[PDB]
Subunit: 203 residues, 5 copies
């Protein structure tokens, strides 16, 4: 990272990243992990981080394709030297040039732009690995209400609905997709009931 | 943490937190762990920590609801700019504003207030996820006395009884709810016998 | 720890401690782990460390009983303010007072005395959880000699025999309690044979 | 490492390296791990790192043989003292001489030369441990398309084909070697279809 | 360690050591790890490190016996104060004295001598726990050639043969002890074939 002088990336960050990816794959919570681990990262460090993933090479090739396409679109829209597309990807620029950019006046936040492209690609990948849609989640005859609610809320988070859409899904789908007994309990609770009241009544 | 200058959050804290939650769920001892891991944390850091949990998304939504309700009640009671409820929760304030606040004279301890709200929500959730009451724990015909005592004391800790109530429960319930052989042994020991003496006599 | 200024306790120490207790219970080697992890700890830190154990709440109550009894005996024998019994246990003293005491001239090593009380309680508890005595360990008809010797020496360490007693036990008991074939081999080796020679002859 | 003064190598790097090798063997992503962990390493540190691997002793001896061959060829092409072949391997030079070299003006990048030889040997070994060729990868009757594609791309990365060859393999082989249903779907998609479109159509 | 002032040993080193011993027992690669973790260690630190091992108490008693034997022989051969035998083992000297010796002029590297004795004892124990000799490794009818070669070379590394003897063993024994198909392949390859060529031909 940069903190102003350059500091070597620690092995701990690499090990944490590889372990999170091995254990959690592309579950939605991996993205805030990337965001925390990439604080202050240069493009070289980010490329190192990307290369450190051992599995899922299809996803990583997709990521390379998306980042290079976004860099080409940047070069089409936005023609010490000025950084070009191949400069943002860290493949034709040296560390010293990146350090110079990070400490120039005014600063050119090339790291933040690369991180934004990377988070866009990860969002695409997480969207791709979405197991099932929200409408396909229905409570089993003996499925625990808490476990079913947790799975439903996880699926809703996995989707890309807007806040108004997410709120409407939370309201309508949860009551509509519940098992008949829990649906009757919620209906007896009445509209406007908070999540805690419904959960404590169902149990 | 803050130590005064800002320091980057370490990967170790995130990994420890995720591992404790995966391995222990909401057992009571997770809260002092949270308290230790959040030493000097800004609210942004707390939101990062919260978002990194991958499962139990019902619980995390419950926590968000409780924190936002407490921030609204604070704003109702307590109407550099002055922080509003959503400012205390770190959703509309930047890191730089938080660093400025942490080093202001007099300091405005937004981190301690946010931590208090979070610990209130965790206490509520642990109390809600309490498996069974104290009165339902009875010793089996061949259950080991040490294991039964450990389970009883764990259940008592899980409850929210006051110190006088907890002491009365420890005295009356333990002797009354024990299996007949251990109850007879304790009665033969006599009143005022310490816990260590009773345990070493039962074994 | 204190190193002189106060430094926040690291998550690594908490995670190591909880894991050692989970993996090793009260095997004798857990005590040197406590001694290493509690270097420079304040009483607040010790209470934090104790509270982080999730299981074995019987053991922790026994520890609380022993520490409070020893603090009462200390107050009976030993009636900036002077610390009382409840001050060493960190329940009625603040962090700032502990820092002041730790950096006074002359220093009052309240942490080392508290550590001594804690180690006394751990020695008492480990002795209590001793599975079996030394005399009940006899080699099986087909039990490997190395595994049996390792188990025997572990049991001997678990006991509280003096150095002269331990040495006599190592000499007499090992040869006497061994299976007949290994006993004959050791007798053929002759007195004064070192442990390595006996082990390499038996194998 | 050197950062300029010498710093002791941390235990974390050694533990990370041994664990990565234990868990991933010589999968291709292990090479970027070596590259990140060996930042600033002296030859002594690199020899320690290599020797700490416990299994796969055939591969590590092969690496020693290969490195000594490059050192002999270097001595053939390139006959404060000057470093000789056995000096590049760190077997006949002291710490003081290597530190002196690392800080000479002009610098003699003995670490970079040793690292290049090591990465060449690891690349040779990974090529040797290549399980199967690309042409032997065929989709099963019920094999998931995503898993098959991931395995195919992993195998392709494991190979040493040039960029033009790799691109032609990705285009022709993937469509030709797929199962009939996915092949028909891809043909219906038409030429020029991106990886994301093909993957989202197949699923 | 000493780096010159004394620094407290970190919990990370202890945890790494206990984990390596738990996971690898006395496999040969544990020794260079010990050597790296004990950089700059005083004898007090070495005794602490040793005591943190929870299992394998037979081996540790053997190690104590061996170290005391070298200290007695040293005292027989080698009769600010001068360090005696019991002083090198850290049982009768204080920390202040050890720091004083480590910084004396000329320095007396009593720590290096203790480390040499410790590595001698570990080498003796690893040799003793050597499972089988080199001559007993024969390829199975369907055993993979790579796995068999790795196991054979690991066994060879476990031995203490000289370089000329080890090299002759690697050449003659590997080809002679191989399964008939691989032996025929190697014979068809001809003398002077390198290990990589033979391995890539066999596969």
């Amino acid at each position: 990272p940069i903190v102003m002088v350059h500091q070597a990336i620690s092995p701990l960050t690499l090990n944490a990243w590889v372990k999170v990816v091995e254990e959690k794959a592309f579950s939605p919570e991996v993205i805030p992990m990337f965001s925390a681990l990439s604080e202050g990262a240069t493009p070289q460090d980010l490329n190192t981080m990307l290369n450190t993933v051992g599995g899922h090479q299809a996803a990583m090739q997709m990521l390379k394709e998306t980042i290079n396409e976004e860099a080409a679109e940047w070069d089409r829209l936005h023609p010490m030297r000025e950084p070009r597309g191949s400069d943002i990807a860290g493949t034709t620029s040296t560390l010293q040039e990146q350090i110079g950019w990070m400490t120039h006046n005014p600063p050119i936040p090339v790291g933040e732009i690369y991180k934004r492209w990377i988070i866009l690609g990860l969002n695409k990948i997480v969207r791709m690995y979405s197991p099932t849609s929200i409408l396909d989640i229905r409570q089993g005859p003996k499925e625990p209400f808490r476990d079913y609610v947790d799975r439903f809320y996880k699926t809703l988070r996995a989707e890309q609905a807007s806040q108004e859409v997410k709120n409407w899904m939370t309201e309508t789908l949860l009551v509509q997709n519940a098992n008949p007994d829990c649906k009757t309990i919620l209906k007896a609770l009445g509209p406007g009931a908070t999540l805690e009241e419904m959960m404590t009544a169902c149990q």
